[PDB]
Design a protein around this nucleic acid. Structure first.
Lengths: 93, 97, 106, 79, 425, 22, 81, 97, 93, 108
DNA sequence: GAGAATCCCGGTGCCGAGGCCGCTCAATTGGTCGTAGACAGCTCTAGCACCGCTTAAACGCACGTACGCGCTGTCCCCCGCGTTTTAACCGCCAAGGGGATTACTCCCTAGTCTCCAGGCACGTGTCAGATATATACATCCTGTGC
DNA sequence: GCACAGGATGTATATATCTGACACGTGCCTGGAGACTAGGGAGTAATCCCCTTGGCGGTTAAAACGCGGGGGACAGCGCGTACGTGCGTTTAAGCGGTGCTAGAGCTGTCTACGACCAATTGAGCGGCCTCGGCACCGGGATTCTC
């Protein structure tokens, strides 16, 4: 028994495109993509919190990390929507 | 009694290959090469079929990129014929020694 | 209730928090950090599969094959810049021809 | 002959993927050498991962692991 | 308090004329109190307390600090010596940026050496001074020195020179001192060479200098007598004289005369053969017996570091209290001279020339031996004047040994040739 | 003010220690 | 605006090239190399400054910049101490 | 007078520069350049001096590498004179844009 | 209060070439070099041991990682030194 | 009971306790065996020893005494194993390698 | 102007891509606490601005000579087309061998108190460059007569 | 027009000083070593089942091989040009000096965010199932080409 992101990415796909099918090798391509990006963010945030002598991971360190490895016109939109999500989660306590 | 212009068929099969995405090297000889280069490190290594395809896709990606940059290096030198000095120029310029 | 629902996201904040727990990065992990990671990962997933759907519509196909993924990842120079050292299985190569390689004139 | 298992039309097909018009006839043996030294490093890195796991068959996992180590990572075969 | 009042009045008169001064007097009559009286009378006349420079060798730097501490404690004394951080602390401590005369600012007295003039000439290119004093100007006479370049370039606009012997007679240093007094009028050495030679040059230099001698005051100083000792070579000192010329510059031709062990030490090394293989050292011991029998203060001068490091082996046998000075630290030059002029149980001193033969108060000794002090009579005159100062309470006997029939005879004749030129002029 | 006075006193003490003992 | 990018003087590019060992240098290379200098500078200094205000400091020390060089695989020694 | 061959003195100063250690661009124009390139991301930004030295020696390392393989790209291209297309080719083969 | 490796690299320099000084810039070069090598070898051994779902760092995975990074001749010299050192340490009798 | 550290018990000069401490809160893993710090200590000792040997004979070739970074650059970049190990690094005050192309020489 | 070579369209499955049911661990909820981060305060090191003089170096300008580049004849070695044979692909069989799974122990490494000495931080003793100086001795430049 | 004597000059080689840049001896403090506890992770071992490598055999596109020829690399030669060379004229880094000031960093202190433990429930993964998107085979329109 193993975990993946099958139904979740399929729900995103059907949410924006209710007619396009997905191949499982293409799905494995994008699974390797998403956990690769997750690994890069997590490792960069771990290094960044290690430089500042802070033993905790918080939203500010991963905020700086996604600010810095993500290039222009994709970083700022991601930062905006993630701040929107964390504010609507913190307000919905 | 016909003969095509040299350059007419070659461009059209470059287009036919570039629209395509299939495999170029036959699978079984590359299987032979990876088994004979594997065995000198430890004997009797079984091989999953998926690892073989991983080696395959890696080497077509690397050789396609190498030929693309070598063709750019050759066309910088006002030539349409590549040469082994252009291969060594590409290997000099990418920095992989 | 799901914590992804109370943030309004479709990716598992609990599962990615659990993966961050044994991910061995620091001793203590803030609560909003998996929420922010969930949001940004679903955003990047959203534009990648959205451009994949655009490429599927551009070539009359209702199925996503890795040729569509390669054509969608290498046309955008930004995602080409982020995916510069990454290759795609059965992806293919964008047909790009140097202008002097074309034969004849006019 | 087992070194030369790959053939001249295969290098031809890879060149036409690369968009190459004219190819000199002395490219092929050094291209075979470049291929033989390129996959040598990844075989060497994959078999060390294989033997450290106390297993004597390789998989796709440790070879794409080695490719991710050496900077030319691959998607779609796990990892 | 003495006849130096008319001298400082003459210097103030030529100051009012507007030219720079020359003193051609031997050190020992107390020119330091003359200089501080000049500065005191200038502060009384037109009220300057600020920018003053004293250029002084490191042996007499703390000495001059000592007399200005004891005599005129009104001024604020600032030493300028040491390592780089303390030097920066001092350069900060005269922040200044307020020219002409200032009253409440502690930069009254600057004391330094020739080298820290030279090495901080970039640091001292600024800060237009008013009155510099350059004491013992024997070391400025060369026109090719870097100290000469950075001391000409100073725009203090007063170049009073203090020296013991300006009479080195090098045919160019007269033009050098004339050029340092007034740089506009004196630049062309060839015109001075072209312009009976002994008589005519007397009236050229006449009004600038003052004529003083030590035989004007009462002579209780000890009226020093030059008793000389001539000796032969030993057989070890004989054989070296032909094995030097068997292989055939003058520097190794000098140290062969002093001791045969200066090239090969006796090894397995008896001291009694070591002392008697040099007839120069042999005659020291017979003199040393009668001076210890009198119980008398003995001063020894030296020229080279090799001969500098052999008498303390010889002094072990007599177990004599002895302190050598040379390379030695300046703070050790403070207390050891202070130990000399206080302790009476001390008898023996090994000295070099350019440190101890300049301006150190040595009035409690009279018996001074010159081992090889024959390189320059001007330094020898300064070395003799270092002991023969005001305050010596008895007669001064100056023993000066020499070895006969050697290269020293030719070197003493070249010294005597430089002797007889300079005392006439 | 107090730091400037302390620095001036330290400079005077350094000049006294180097000037009277060296 | 000001002579900043051309403040890097045209014999200095030539001297930096002659460290590498070139012989003949064309005249039009200088502004292109100036562009190469400036385009290297902004995509190193954006990482340096993001490290800078992440530490709640508005001066740039010598440590966050050497990790900024460490980011893209162009690491530096000696200043990391 | 007597002149030398154009190139023999060039090799003399080539080995003089390669025997050198120090930095060859003045500190004030580079300081003003990094201060005027640092303002757009964030204003009033002070700088450590050794940080400026880090930017310095990093960018001479990058420029000597770029000029060296640009020289090799030119010497592949049957020339000694170096043009714009050498820079474009070398920046293509390094991969950055 | 600072941390460095300066005394140890000083004394391993002194025992093989006693007539040799060291510059402080070179001293920082060595400190940054040994920090880089230690960090690289530790993050490699860490992620490979985590890759084989192994929770423990031992000498076997780090000598595997030495066989990964270091070039083979100095790698085999290094693992020879490591084996002799660990057999000396394990024989604590 | 009075015993010394584990470095000389392993016969090593680099501090095994210090690198062990760096291994604990370096968050590489939560479980660390005993042989890993002594093995890492030995490996770093060997690398430092060979780097210092190349720096030493680089200095003796230039007949100096203090290790200038020129000595370190000529020790590192003139060895191909260190070229493979230190390919992407830039060294402070190191300069460039003395080399010239043969076509650049005046071959006449 | 014909013709091999392209795209597009009609029929054939078919096998491979989405729902459906079960439920099993894994996401979610609530109380404790203590320790790591946030914020105020102080300091003092150090970074910026500016004054003023300096001079190696940078810019302008005139020359010119080796090299980049345009052209032009020379092979000659790659490229397109028959032809075969030959080795890869495909379908299937097996078997056994090696990864996957689970249980059970034990030992080894995590957590805590003590302590004392290993490793600094900051002082002082101890050698290489630099300036200066006589002085004979050999060397160079210069004025002079046959 | 050439040989001979007088004056200037390097200069060497040490000392003497004499600063400038280094190896070595004490306080201290904090962190590694040792002793004790414990608990859960790894080692070991039996078993299972899945897949992986040979092993036939047919068959079938693909490479090996050779021929004709033709277009591109290549040697060389002019020419003109474009940057190397050198020197006059600013000039603007640079040094260093100083003055100010401001924020990096250390300490204290609170408090509040999440690790951890006990409990739960639910939804995500897997076997099983259904049906349709499209690769493939055959026929027709179309396109640069020689």
């Amino acid at each position: 028994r193993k975990e993946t992101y099958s139904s979740y990415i399929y729900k995103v796909l059907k949410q924006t495109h209710p007619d396009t099918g997905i191949s499982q090798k293409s799905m494995s391509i994008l699974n390797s993509f998403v956990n690769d990006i997750f690994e890069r963010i997590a490792t960069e945030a771990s290094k960044l919190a290690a430089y500042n002598k802070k033993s905790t991971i918080s939203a500010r360190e991963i905020q700086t990390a996604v600010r810095l490895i993500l290039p222009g016109e994709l970083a700022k939109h991601a930062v905006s929507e993630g701040t929107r999500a964390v504010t609507k989660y913190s307000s919905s306590t | 009694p016909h003969r095509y212009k040299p350059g007419t068929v070659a461009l059209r099969e470059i287009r036919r290959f570039q629209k395509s995405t299939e495999l170029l090297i036959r699978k079984l000889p590359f299987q032979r090469l990876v088994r004979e280069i594997a065995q000198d490190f430890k004997t009797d290594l079984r091989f999953q079929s998926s690892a073989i395809g991983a080696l395959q896709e890696s080497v077509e990606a690397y050789l396609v990129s190498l030929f693309e940059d070598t063709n750019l290096a050759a066309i910088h030198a006002k030539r349409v014929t590549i040469q082994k000095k252009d291969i060594k120029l590409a290997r000099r310029l990418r920095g992989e020694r | 209730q799901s914590r992804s629902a109370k943030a309004g996201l479709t990716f598992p904040v609990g599962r990615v928090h659990r993966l961050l727990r044994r991910g061995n990065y620091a001793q203590r992990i803030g609560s909003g950090a998996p929420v922010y990671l969930t949001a940004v990962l679903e955003y990047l997933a959203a534009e990648i599969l959205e451009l994949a759907g655009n490429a599927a519509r551009d070539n009359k196909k209702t199925r996503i094959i890795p040729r569509h993924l390669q054509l969608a990842i290498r046309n955008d120079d930004e995602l080409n810049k982020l995916l510069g050292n990454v290759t795609i299985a059965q992806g293919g190569v964008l047909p790009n021809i140097h202008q002097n390689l074309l034969p004849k004139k006019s | 002959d087992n070194i030369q298992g790959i053939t001249k039309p295969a290098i031809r097909r890879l060149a036409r993927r690369g968009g190459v018009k004219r190819i000199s006839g002395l490219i092929y043996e050094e291209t075979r050498g470049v291929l033989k030294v390129f996959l040598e490093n990844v075989i060497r890195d994959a078999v060390t991962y294989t033997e450290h796991a106390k297993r004597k068959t390789v998989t796709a996992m440790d070879v794409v692991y080695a490719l991710k180590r050496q900077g030319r990572t691959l998607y779609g075969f796990g990892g | 308090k003495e006849y130096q009042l008319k001298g400082l009045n003459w210097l103030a008169n030529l100051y009012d004329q507007g030219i720079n001064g020359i003193l051609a007097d031997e050190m020992g009559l107390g020119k330091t109190v003359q200089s501080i009286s000049v500065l005191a009378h200038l502060a009384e006349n037109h009220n300057i307390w600020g920018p003053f420079l004293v250029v002084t060798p490191a042996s007499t730097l703390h000495n001059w600090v000592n007399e200005i501490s004891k005599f005129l404690p009104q001024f604020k004394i600032l030493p300028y010596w040491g390592n780089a951080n303390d030097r920066k602390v001092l350069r900060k401590f005269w922040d200044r940026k307020n020219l002409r005369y200032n009253k409440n600012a502690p930069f009254h007295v600057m004391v330094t050496s020739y080298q820290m003039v030279v090495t901080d000439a970039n640091y001292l290119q600024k800060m237009k001074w008013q009155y510099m004093i350059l004491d013992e100007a024997q070391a400025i006479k060369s026109s090719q020195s870097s100290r000469w370049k950075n001391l000409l370039s100073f725009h203090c606009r007063n170049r009073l020179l203090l020296t013991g012997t300006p009479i080195q007679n090098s045919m160019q240093e007269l033009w050098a001192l004339l050029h340092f007094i007034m740089p506009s009028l004196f630049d062309s050495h060839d015109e001075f060479n072209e312009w009976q030679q002994l008589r005519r040059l007397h009236m050229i230099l006449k009004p600038f200098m003052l004529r003083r001698v030590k035989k004007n005051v009462q002579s209780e100083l000890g009226d020093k007598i030059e008793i000389d000792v001539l000796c032969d070579l030993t057989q070890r000192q004989a054989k070296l004289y032909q094995v030097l010329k068997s292989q055939i510059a003058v520097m190794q031709f000098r140290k062969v005369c002093n001791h045969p062990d200066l090239f090969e030490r006796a090894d397995v090394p008896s001291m009694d053969r070591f002392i008697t293989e040099s007839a120069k050292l042999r005659k020291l011991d017979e003199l040393l017996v009668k001076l210890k029998s009198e119980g008398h203060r003995v001063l020894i001068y030296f020229q080279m570091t090799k001969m500098m490091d052999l008498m303390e082996e010889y002094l072990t046998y007599r177990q004599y209290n002895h302190i050598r000075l040379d390379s030695s630290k300046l703070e050790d030059r403070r207390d050891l001279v202070h130990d000399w002029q206080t302790n009476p149980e001390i008898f023996v001193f090994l000295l070099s020339t350019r440190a101890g033969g300049l301006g150190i108060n040595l009035t409690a000794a009279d018996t001074v031996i010159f081992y090889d002090s024959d390189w320059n009579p001007t330094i020898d005159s300064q070395a003799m004047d270092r002991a023969h100062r005001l305050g010596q309470t008895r007669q001064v006997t100056v023993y000066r040994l020499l070895v006969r029939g050697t290269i020293e005879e030719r070197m003493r004749d070249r010294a005597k040739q430089k002797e007889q030129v300079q005392q006439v002029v | 003010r107090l730091e400037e006075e302390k620095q001036d006193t330290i400079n005077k003490l350094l000049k006294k220690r180097a000037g009277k003992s060296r």
